[PDB]
């Protein structure tokens, strides 16, 4: 679900995925179009895409369980959809922590014209 995205998120990075990752460029938060801003931009792009291997699970709202053996986030196994929400969740979580040293505060509440064009997943 959303809210567990965030609380993994938080255990990665340190931010709150509000407002730090809720509005952040073009991809995160909203997604839509354009060409990612950044890598971070582009851990959502893949989120995005990630989630839209999906189209018959439902992100926002389906739990999923994980647990952490040392460091490691492991998915637990649920439903079919919660163990590839988590695995996109998962993945996005290690990508915004990976890419933490380029995060940059100047793409919080990007505006949305200036992101335009499809690019596809």
Same mark, same amino acid.
């Given at each position: 679900?959303?809210?567990?995205?965030?609380?993994?998120?938080?255990?990665?990075?340190?931010?709150?995925?509000?407002? &730090?990752? &809720?509005?952040?460029?073009?991809? =995160? @938060?909203? @997604?839509?179009? @354009?060409?990612?801003?950044?890598?971070?931009?582009?851990?959502?792009?893949?989120?995005?895409c990630?989630? @839209?291997?999906?189209?018959? =699970?439902?992100?926002?709202?389906?739990?999923?369980?994980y647990?952490?053996?040392?460091?490691?986030?492991?998915?637990?196994?649920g439903?079919?959809?919660?163990?590839?929400?988590?695995?996109?969740?998962?993945?996005?979580?290690? =990508?915004?922590?990976?890419?933490?040293?380029?995060?940059?505060?100047?793409?919080?509440?990007?505006?949305?014209?200036?992101?335009?064009?499809?690019?596809?997943?």
């Amino acid at each position: 679900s959303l809210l567990e995205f965030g609380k993994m998120i938080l255990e990665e990075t340190g931010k709150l995925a509000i407002p &730090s990752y &809720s509005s952040y460029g073009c991809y =995160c @938060g909203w @997604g839509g179009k @354009g060409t990612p801003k950044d890598a971070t931009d582009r851990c959502c792009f893949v989120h995005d895409c990630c989630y @839209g291997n999906l189209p018959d =699970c439902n992100p926002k709202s389906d739990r999923y369980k994980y647990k952490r053996v040392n460091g490691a986030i492991v998915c637990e196994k649920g439903t079919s959809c919660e163990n590839r929400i988590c695995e996109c969740d998962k993945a996005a979580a290690i =990508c915004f922590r990976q890419n933490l040293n380029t995060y940059s505060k100047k793409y919080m509440l990007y505006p949305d014209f200036l992101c335009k064009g499809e690019l596809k997943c």
